[PDB]
Scaffold this motif. Structure first.
Motif, mmCIF file in Angstrom:
data_model
loop_
_atom_site.group_PDB
_atom_site.id
_atom_site.type_symbol
_atom_site.label_atom_id
_atom_site.label_comp_id
_atom_site.label_asym_id
_atom_site.label_seq_id
_atom_site.Cartn_x
_atom_site.Cartn_y
_atom_site.Cartn_z
ATOM 1 N N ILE A 14 0.592 -1.171 -0.101
ATOM 2 C CA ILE A 14 -0.061 -0.069 -0.125
ATOM 3 C C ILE A 14 0.968 1.166 0.127
ATOM 4 C CG2 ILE A 14 -1.897 -1.204 1.263
ATOM 5 C CD1 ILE A 14 -0.882 0.547 3.720
ATOM 6 N N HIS A 15 0.215 2.621 -0.159
ATOM 7 C CA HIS A 15 0.936 3.549 -0.230
ATOM 8 C C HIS A 15 1.163 4.124 1.207
ATOM 9 C CE1 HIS A 15 2.504 7.749 -1.632
ATOM 10 N NE2 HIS A 15 2.764 7.088 -2.680
ATOM 11 N N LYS A 16 2.161 4.946 1.430
ATOM 12 C CA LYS A 16 2.508 5.565 2.589
ATOM 13 C C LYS A 16 1.629 6.619 2.841
ATOM 14 C CE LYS A 16 6.579 7.417 3.400
ATOM 15 N NZ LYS A 16 7.400 8.720 3.165
ATOM 16 N N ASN A 17 0.786 7.165 2.104
ATOM 17 C CA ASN A 17 -0.402 8.184 1.964
ATOM 18 C C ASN A 17 -1.588 7.393 2.552
ATOM 19 O OD1 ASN A 17 1.682 9.495 0.982
ATOM 20 N ND2 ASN A 17 0.106 10.568 -0.705
ATOM 21 N N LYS A 18 -1.641 6.055 2.203
ATOM 22 C CA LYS A 18 -2.791 5.353 2.653
ATOM 23 C C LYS A 18 -2.726 4.993 4.154
ATOM 24 C CE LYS A 18 -5.709 1.356 1.442
ATOM 25 N NZ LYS A 18 -6.555 0.682 0.601
ATOM 26 N N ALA A 19 -1.360 4.300 4.472
ATOM 27 C CA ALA A 19 -1.089 3.958 5.693
ATOM 28 C C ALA A 19 -1.371 5.184 6.732
ATOM 29 C CB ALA A 19 0.061 3.611 5.920
ATOM 30 N N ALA A 20 -0.918 6.313 6.405
ATOM 31 C CA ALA A 20 -1.001 7.529 7.108
ATOM 32 C C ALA A 20 -2.528 8.285 7.237
ATOM 33 C CB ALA A 20 -0.230 8.704 6.648
ATOM 34 N N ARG A 21 -3.168 8.014 6.098
ATOM 35 C CA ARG A 21 -4.737 8.062 6.395
ATOM 36 C C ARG A 21 -5.239 7.473 7.449
ATOM 37 N NH1 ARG A 21 -5.800 7.943 1.275
ATOM 38 N NH2 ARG A 21 -6.049 5.660 1.062
ATOM 39 N N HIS A 22 -4.915 6.100 7.104
ATOM 40 C CA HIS A 22 -5.513 5.036 8.325
ATOM 41 C C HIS A 22 -5.246 5.430 9.542
ATOM 42 C CE1 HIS A 22 -7.583 2.536 5.661
ATOM 43 N NE2 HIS A 22 -6.958 1.682 5.380
ATOM 44 N N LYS A 23 -3.887 5.750 9.872
ATOM 45 C CA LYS A 23 -3.499 6.015 11.362
ATOM 46 C C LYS A 23 -4.346 7.371 11.511
ATOM 47 C CE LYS A 23 0.797 5.981 10.381
ATOM 48 N NZ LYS A 23 2.242 5.977 10.436
ATOM 49 N N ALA A 24 -4.285 8.335 10.833
ATOM 50 C CA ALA A 24 -5.228 9.738 11.374
ATOM 51 C C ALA A 24 -6.485 9.098 11.384
ATOM 52 C CB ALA A 24 -5.177 10.449 10.182
ATOM 53 N N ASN A 25 -7.355 8.587 10.577
ATOM 54 C CA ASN A 25 -8.517 8.232 11.128
ATOM 55 C C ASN A 25 -8.872 7.590 12.192
ATOM 56 O OD1 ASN A 25 -9.482 9.430 8.535
ATOM 57 N ND2 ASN A 25 -9.399 7.536 7.386
ATOM 58 N N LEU A 26 -8.183 6.524 12.581
ATOM 59 C CA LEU A 26 -8.298 5.919 13.586
ATOM 60 C C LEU A 26 -7.848 6.478 15.181
ATOM 61 C CD1 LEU A 26 -7.156 2.125 12.408
ATOM 62 C CD2 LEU A 26 -9.470 3.182 12.880
ATOM 63 N N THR A 27 -6.798 7.383 14.798
ATOM 64 C CA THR A 27 -6.519 8.325 16.029
ATOM 65 C C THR A 27 -7.529 9.260 16.253
ATOM 66 O OG1 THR A 27 -4.185 8.079 15.441
ATOM 67 C CG2 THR A 27 -4.972 9.850 16.704
ATOM 68 N N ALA A 28 -8.341 9.959 15.219
ATOM 69 C CA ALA A 28 -9.222 10.858 15.222
ATOM 70 C C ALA A 28 -10.784 10.459 15.998
ATOM 71 C CB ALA A 28 -9.705 11.336 14.046
ATOM 72 N N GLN A 29 -10.979 9.085 15.449
ATOM 73 C CA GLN A 29 -12.225 8.543 16.183
ATOM 74 C C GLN A 29 -11.687 8.021 17.592
ATOM 75 O OE1 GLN A 29 -15.181 6.546 14.374
ATOM 76 N NE2 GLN A 29 -14.183 6.313 12.372
ATOM 77 N N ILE A 30 -10.618 7.467 17.931
ATOM 78 C CA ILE A 30 -10.399 7.059 19.350
ATOM 79 C C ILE A 30 -10.145 8.091 20.249
ATOM 80 C CG2 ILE A 30 -8.127 6.429 20.509
ATOM 81 C CD1 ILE A 30 -8.830 4.063 18.203
ATOM 82 N N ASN A 31 -9.481 9.232 19.889
ATOM 83 C CA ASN A 31 -9.421 10.338 20.748
ATOM 84 C C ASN A 31 -10.847 11.109 20.944
ATOM 85 O OD1 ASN A 31 -6.835 10.076 21.022
ATOM 86 N ND2 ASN A 31 -6.106 11.649 19.482
ATOM 87 N N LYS A 32 -11.658 11.061 19.722
ATOM 88 C CA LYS A 32 -13.044 11.613 19.859
ATOM 89 C C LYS A 32 -13.982 10.896 20.805
ATOM 90 C CE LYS A 32 -15.990 11.702 16.400
ATOM 91 N NZ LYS A 32 -16.421 11.989 15.189
ATOM 92 N N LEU A 33 -13.560 9.620 20.985
ATOM 93 C CA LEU A 33 -14.376 8.665 21.861
ATOM 94 C C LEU A 33 -14.479 8.988 23.309
ATOM 95 C CD1 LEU A 33 -16.060 6.122 22.082
ATOM 96 C CD2 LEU A 33 -14.062 4.768 22.395
ATOM 97 N N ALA A 34 -15.447 8.889 24.168
ATOM 98 C CA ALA A 34 -15.267 9.210 25.591
ATOM 99 C C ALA A 34 -14.332 8.025 26.136
ATOM 100 C CB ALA A 34 -16.638 8.966 26.326
#
Ligand code: MG
Ligand code: MG
Ligand code: MG
Ligand code: MG
Ligand code: MG
Ligand code: MG
Ligand code: MG
Ligand code: MG
Ligand code: MG
Ligand code: MG
Ligand code: MG
Ligand code: MG
Ligand code: MG
Ligand code: MG
Ligand code: MG
Ligand code: MG
Ligand code: MG
Ligand code: MG
Ligand code: MG
Ligand code: MG
Ligand code: MG
Ligand code: MG
Ligand code: MG
Ligand code: MG
Ligand code: MG
Ligand code: MG
Ligand code: MG
Ligand code: MG
Ligand code: MG
Ligand code: MG
Ligand code: MG
Ligand code: MG
Ligand code: MG
Ligand code: MG
Ligand code: MG
Ligand code: MG
Ligand code: MG
Ligand code: MG
Ligand code: MG
Ligand code: MG
Ligand code: MG
Ligand code: MG
Ligand code: MG
Ligand code: MG
Ligand code: MG
Lengths: 82, 80, 205, 86
Positions: free
Chosen positions: D66-86
């Motif tokens: 996969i591309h580095k951009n795809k891996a970074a996007r996945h990391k960003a999305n998951l971090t965003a959701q986890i931090n936005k979780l209570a």
RNA sequence: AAAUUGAAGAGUUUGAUCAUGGCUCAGAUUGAACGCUGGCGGCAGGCCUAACACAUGCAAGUCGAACGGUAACAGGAAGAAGCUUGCUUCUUUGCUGACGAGUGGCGGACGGGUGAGUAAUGUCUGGGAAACUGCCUGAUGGAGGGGGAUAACUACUGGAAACGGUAGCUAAUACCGCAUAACGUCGCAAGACCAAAGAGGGGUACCUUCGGGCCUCUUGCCAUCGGAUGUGCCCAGAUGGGAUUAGCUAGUAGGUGGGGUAACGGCUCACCUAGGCGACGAUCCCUAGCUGGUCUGAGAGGAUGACCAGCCACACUGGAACUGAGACACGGUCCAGACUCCUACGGGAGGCAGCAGUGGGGAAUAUUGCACAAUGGGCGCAAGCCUGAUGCAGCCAUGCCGCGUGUAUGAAGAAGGCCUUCGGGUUGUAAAGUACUUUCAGCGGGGAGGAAGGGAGUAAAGUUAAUACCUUUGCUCAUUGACGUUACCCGCAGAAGAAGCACCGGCUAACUCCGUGCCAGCAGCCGCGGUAAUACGGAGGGUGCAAGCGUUAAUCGGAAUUACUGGGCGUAAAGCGCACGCAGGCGGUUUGUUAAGUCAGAUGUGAAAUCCCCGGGCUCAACCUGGGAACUGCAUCUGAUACUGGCAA
């Protein structure tokens, strides 16, 4: 790969190569980035057998363009004649 | 310093967007009579501050929707 | 590619001497010059303006031995060139190698000069030229080659040359059989009974 | 295929396809596990799954699956959701 | 300095005239076809119709300096033998030069073909940000230590074949961990996380398990940041015909959020809002690849998009993804369909819109050629290998340009033909004869240039421990040409080997006789032909072109006959039956302001080729080529404010 090479146009049995800078994938007598001189193998010996804008050649070489064996020979021969 | 168009808002019924008509004079290609031509552009309007008929200043930007590619820089005159 | 038929017939048709013979003899002692050729030559044609234009073009063409295609290209080049179109057309016609050889007198006629040129007997700047339509330029040296300089016809032709009027714009040394094309001839130095403007009209009808 | 290189290219492409499919399915499995943790609402479990998932997507991106951009996007999305979780 | 210099009409309505008006002709041009004829050369061009179907042969390979290896041929080494004592012979030995098959790396996404589709997802012009980018290039650092397999191979085995199937064996720059990590990624930080591969050349000593270790050079690998190139994406204007197509659109239009992509984005979802396009022509139908450009035209324009070049789309038809930096892939994979073909009837193979070529369609378009010598392209350190790209050749008067087919003299104006008012006239200096030349073709001899390089040795400078190796620079040697018997030059012979086609009533240059008798026939229009026909057919004479000439088809012109430049409407075709009036078009006069239109200047861009100007080289020209002008445009910036527009009075 940017390369400096000859685009033979001439006529039958009377070639007139044009030194052109181009993407190596494009056809010989096709898309070229910039023309940097000409070479006429047949020469009246009073005409300009080879003209080269060495400055632009150096510019593109520094940018990273490779050089065909014949263009390198032409550059070396004109600098030796000088 | 920034390329810009000026026009008037013809419809604002869309959420956060407006359609602006840019009118210009062009010499007719053959006959020559200078004829008015209009170009309607779907424009991005945060806060929906543009009312119908207002004259607004627009600039080009990245694609924001299926059609929206322009953003409102400023209102010039409003509620004529 | 060249007209090979009888020559005095053309002169009879055009109503004037076209120098298609050496000149040694008066042309009226060789033909009925003043009568058109053919069965109905005696009748006189009330000729239209298009007819007179065609006759003028044909007269010039048959004088210089040039066919229609080549003459058309000559007209196109003269029109392209700057200045009086008819005058540069006449300059182009008079600049032909065979015409220059005839003016310098190596041939009794333009046909003989053309044969001399064709048979590798004429040099331009010491180079063998075998094309009749070779354009001679100012400050050119046209010379008879040594091998062909002993032909009896050229030594015969030089007498006719000295008996006709000598062109101003050519300097001919007959002893060495060499000549210098000093300059392009003007309109005034060549015959004044050529109505080139008729040709200009004909190639714009 | 008629050309000698064409036959070998087909064979190599099938082999590479199987290897790539295996590794890509592994990565997607580890991502869907963290998505299920998020949908279960446990910050701790989702963080454990995220910190185990992180080293693997980077390695597959570096290995070109996969591309580095795809891996970074996945990391960003998951971090965003986890931090936005209570 | 130059980049223009540029425009023709005629016939035909009537007893005659003027006008309107249609028809026709004279000019160029062709990817042309047909008829008669035909010598040479240079350059260029050659399925426009069936993207119809395809026999056969070639069009994509390369690397032993990644690797396991040795099937083949060349060595060597051992090795006994024929026996000539080492003249050979068999047998091993991948120990060497190399290499069939195989793994692996790179390349098949370029080069080449065609225009079916596409009326805008396309192209042209000008802008822009939210992206990637193999090989190339600059900088900065790394390059540690392990592991499990699988081809090849062997064994067994299915099937007719294609193609397989089970079990063992081996290797790497194949694959996978672990270590290491920032200026890299995520985050606000804190932190977390992330990679790699060797190979080759030589070697003073030194250690050595004799393999090497070790030193050095070259090349290769990983990470990040740039450079360049290429590519993806977004906006505006422009980009056919039809209104006897007026309405279209529910992922449609916008928004929040999730998902997906290299990237923005209804790209996709879930929900909410109910919008969006259209008379400045949406939608629907028909037609068509676009552009630089080509033909024509005085110009504006009209037509057109062959060859060269830029872009797009397609690869038997329909669909799909995979590998990969790059494809949804011409000579790759899978499926469906029609075909064609192999058969053991179970099963399989194929895709000339690549180069030649065959059949078919048609008026019509060529050789199953030679070479990688030059320019490029792929692999490679290189030598080199491959290349139907390319360079050349073969075929054709298809077009453009050049040249010859003899030159001079020659009146007895010969003969013969034709005419004759019978005197003559004309073919006609034409011929014959008499002098001269030998271009091109024919025969013989010489001979460039396209050739740069590369290989060997030397020398010097790097090099480092090293006068090794390697790189650079010289110098020396023998070589590299398909075209090709080349261009060109010299010699021999002998006018000797070489002229046809259309027309002759007017338009339109060129006229008589005979035959024919409104028959046969001609014709672009007007028109001819019923007894002397310059119009039919033959002859003589003549006119125009010329190795061509005519006929047909198509475009522009003439056509001011779609008139914007540049037309009309009382009676020739043409003012709605009349009025109101929305959209639209235009608008009195003064002052201010605005800089939209307008003008000026500058910048960028308007690919190269083509046209034009001044030159240069092929013996000239066509042709090739140097510099320039031009490409009238578009966009931006700074100015001017008379006129038009906006605003204010
Ligand atoms: Mg000719
Ligand atoms: Mg063709
Ligand atoms: Mg091999
Ligand atoms: Mg292509
Ligand atoms: Mg390792
Ligand atoms: Mg192993
Ligand atoms: Mg790690
Ligand atoms: Mg690795
Ligand atoms: Mg068009
Ligand atoms: Mg979104
Ligand atoms: Mg979009
Ligand atoms: Mg089509
Ligand atoms: Mg006109
Ligand atoms: Mg495609
Ligand atoms: Mg087909
Ligand atoms: Mg398909
Ligand atoms: Mg991929
Ligand atoms: Mg495909
Ligand atoms: Mg392919
Ligand atoms: Mg094929
Ligand atoms: Mg073919
Ligand atoms: Mg046929
Ligand atoms: Mg080659
Ligand atoms: Mg081959
Ligand atoms: Mg070949
Ligand atoms: Mg007689
Ligand atoms: Mg010869
Ligand atoms: Mg040579
Ligand atoms: Mg007449
Ligand atoms: Mg009769
Ligand atoms: Mg007739
Ligand atoms: Mg009669
Ligand atoms: Mg007749
Ligand atoms: Mg016709
Ligand atoms: Mg017109
Ligand atoms: Mg009128
Ligand atoms: Mg009327
Ligand atoms: Mg009225
Ligand atoms: Mg107004
Ligand atoms: Mg006013
Ligand atoms: Mg302005
Ligand atoms: Mg240009
Ligand atoms: Mg010249
Ligand atoms: Mg030039
Ligand atoms: Mg005003």
């Amino acid at each position: 790969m940017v390369t400096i090479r000859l685009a033979r146009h001439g006529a039958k049995k009377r070639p007139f190569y044009q030194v052109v800078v181009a993407d190596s994938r494009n056809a010989r007598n096709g898309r070229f980035i910039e023309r940097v001189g000409f070479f006429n193998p047949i020469a009246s010996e009073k005409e300009e057998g080879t003209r080269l804008d060495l400055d632009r050649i150096a510019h593109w070489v520094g940018q990273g363009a490779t050089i065909s064996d014949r263009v390198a020979a032409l550059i070396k021969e004109v600098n030796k004649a000088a | 310093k920034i390329r810009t168009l000026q026009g008037r808002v013809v419809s604002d019924k869309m959420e956060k967007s407006i359609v602006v008509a840019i009118e210009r004079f062009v010499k007719h290609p053959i006959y020559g009579k200078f004829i008015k031509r209009t170009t309607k552009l779907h424009v991005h309007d945060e806060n929906n501050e543009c009312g119908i008929g207002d004259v607004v200043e627009i600039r080009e930007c990245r694609p924001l929707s299926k059609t929206k590619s322009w953003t409102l820089v400023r209102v010039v005159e409003k509620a004529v | 590619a060249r007209y090979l038929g009888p020559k005095l017939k053309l002169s009879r048709r055009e109503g004037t001497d076209l120098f298609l013979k050496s000149d040694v003899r008066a042309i009226d002692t060789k033909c009925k010059i003043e009568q058109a050729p053919g069965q109905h030559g005696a009748r006189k044609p009330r000729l239209s303006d298009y007819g007179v234009q065609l006759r003028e073009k044909q007269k010039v063409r048959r004088i210089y031995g040039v066919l229609e295609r080549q003459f058309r290209n000559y007209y196109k080049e003269a029109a392209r060139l700057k200045g009086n179109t008819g005058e540069n057309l006449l300059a182009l016609l008079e600049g032909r190698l065979d015409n220059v050889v005839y003016r310098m007198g190596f041939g009794a006629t333009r046909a003989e000069a053309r044969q001399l040129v064709s048979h590798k007997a004429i040099m331009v700047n010491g180079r063998v030229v075998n094309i009749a339509s070779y354009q001679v330029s100012p400050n050119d040296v046209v010379s008879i080659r040594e091998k062909a300089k002993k032909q009896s016809r050229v030594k015969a032709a030089l007498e006719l040359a000295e008996q006709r009027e000598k062109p101003t714009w050519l300097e001919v040394d007959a002893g060495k059989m060499e000549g210098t094309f000093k300059r392009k001839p003007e309109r005034s130095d060549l015959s004044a009974d050529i109505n080139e403007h008729l040709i200009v009209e004909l190639y714009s009808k | 295929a008629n050309i000698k290189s064409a036959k070998k290219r087909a064979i190599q492409s099938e082999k590479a396809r199987k290897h790539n499919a295996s590794r890509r399915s592994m990565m997607r499995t580890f991502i869907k596990k963290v998505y299920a943790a998020i949908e279960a609402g446990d910050k701790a479990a989702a963080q454990k799954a995220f910190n185990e998932m992180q080293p693997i997507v980077d390695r597959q991106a570096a290995k070109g699956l996969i591309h580095k951009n795809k891996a970074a996007r996945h990391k960003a999305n998951l971090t965003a959701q986890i931090n936005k979780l209570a």
